[PDB]
Every structure is written in C-alpha cells, then in structure tokens.
C-alpha cells in the first residue's frame, strides 16, 4: 500500500513522498502520459509499468511487510500480490536513491500539457 511505499522512499532518499514525488514530472504521482522528463521520472514510469503487470492486485491499498537487512530492502512472504507489489516498490525506492543527484525542483507540480507523447511499457 501507499503506506509502505512512502516509508520506503523516506528511508531511502530522506525526502517525503508527498510532495517530493506525488507530483513530479509526467509519471510521478497521478496519471501517466508523455515522455519521462528525467531519470527520476523514468523511475516512476517503470514503477507505473510494474504495477501494470499486476492487473488483479491493488497496489495502493494492499499492505505488505518488508524488513531491512542492514541497508537492504527485503520483502517478506505474504500473498502473491503482496510479494510482487513489494518488489515493484523496492525497485522504485532504489531507483530514486540512485538518481537523487539529478532530482530537479523545476519538475515538481509539472503542468499536464507539457507531457507530450506515448511510450509503451
């Protein structure tokens, strides 16, 4: 669920999911359209795609359990959906950590009309 995803992001980047990643670029947050503006936006695009592979799951509300082995994120055994949701979130959190250096405040609250194009997962 978004409860775990947000704690994961904060632990990983130090930034709060809302509003640092709730309305970033063209894919971080609501909606999905256009060309990812940058690496961080690509992380969200891939994350969106990851959820896309789990049609009969509910990523925003299904809660899962995860632990940290030393710094590593370790998803715990849960239902099939919970396992896959956790793996999708884990990857985005790491992807976010890996691209902090290029995080740009000019992409927060990015207007919709500037998200031009299509991109298949």
């Amino acid at each position: 669920s978004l409860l775990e995803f947000g704690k994961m992001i904060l632990e990983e980047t130090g930034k709060l999911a809302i509003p640092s990643y709730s309305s970033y670029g063209c894919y971080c947050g609501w909606g999905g359209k256009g060309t990812p503006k940058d690496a961080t936006d690509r992380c969200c695009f891939v994350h969106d795609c990851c959820y896309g592979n789990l049609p009969d799951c509910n990523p925003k509300s299904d809660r899962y359990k995860y632990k940290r082995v030393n710094g590593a994120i370790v998803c715990e055994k849960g239902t099939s959906c919970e396992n896959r949701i956790c793996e999708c979130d884990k990857a985005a959190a790491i992807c976010f950590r890996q691209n902090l250096n290029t995080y740009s405040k000019k992409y927060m609250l990015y207007p919709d009309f500037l998200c031009k194009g299509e991109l298949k997962c």
Binding site: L2, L3, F5, G6, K7, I9, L10, L16, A17, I18, Y21, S22, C28, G29, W30, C44, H47, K60, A92
Partner: peptide, 5 residues
C-alpha cells in the same frame, strides 16, 4: 503516511 506516488 505521506505517499500517493
């Protein structure tokens, strides 16, 4: 707590 990404 604090996400809707």
């Amino acid at each position: 707590f604090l996400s809707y990404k």
